[PDB]
Amino acid sequence: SPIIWINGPFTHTAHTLHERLPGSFVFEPEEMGQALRKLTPGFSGDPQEHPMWIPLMLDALQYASREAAGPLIVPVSISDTARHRRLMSGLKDRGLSVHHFTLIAPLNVVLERLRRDVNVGTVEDRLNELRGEQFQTHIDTAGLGTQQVAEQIAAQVGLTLAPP
Amino acid sequence: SPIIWINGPFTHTAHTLHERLPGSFVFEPEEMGQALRKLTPGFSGDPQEHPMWIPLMLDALQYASREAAGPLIVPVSISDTARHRRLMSGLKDRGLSVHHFTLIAPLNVVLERLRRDVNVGTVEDRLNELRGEQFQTHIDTAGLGTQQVAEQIAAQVGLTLAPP
Ligand SMILES: [Cl-]
Ligand SMILES: [Cl-]
């Protein structure tokens, strides 16, 4: 069944798609990061930088793929071109064909989300990096609510959404 | 005196500019990397990933700046948006105002250079990353020889080149 892989600079999109695709399951890669941080002596920093995170999370994803009734929805937040490539070639290796998207979001929307929980230049650098073609397919969310992003993503992948 | 900071995906440009700007000096950041690799217990990997490389190379650059007769020319090869930012804010901190450029080079030119000493997708990912606006000012070298890139860079920074 389809795998919808959504990279973002921030979440709600994944949830919205989930609510409107019956049988769908939200696979959260961070669960593998939390396991690895607890199982590793002397670990610090971003769990998603653990050397085993990419291969073990993708192994789990492959198994999840075989068990999924409906579409498998995977929210990620990756900025590193090298980690992105590693992930993309890992999927391919495992024979997994995913619909992969990167959300291009307006600076003010990102800054406002971060504040409701931040150097503007550092945020803008990130958003500028995501706009690189190594991150295609791009979905620009300017002027769109979560419902409309979800709808746009579903249209691109050829999926019919249940109503809101 | 002006600092001409040239990031590239590959070298010859720096040399050409050097040959046509009397009094100029080519500052090679990799010399600091080689020192740090030899001075560090258990070190492996890219010397330019050494945690002290950014701050110590930039300290050296600041001193070089005070001693330079002519323009200071600095060839770098950086792909990491995070390392790029670190470098850019480090310069600013040290009060150094540099003319910073990233060469956008054609895929075939890069692939051909690498062969004369390589996964096409991995190269293309890198070139796509460099085209991000976090890497401005961009200089697209399509159709240009080293002499013409040098000339273009000099024009942008307001410098008169000696003849070839
Ligand atoms: Cl795209
Ligand atoms: Cl530019």
From TrEMBL, chains A, B:
Pfam families: AAA_33 (PF13671). It comes from the Bacteria. This is Antibiotic resistance protein.
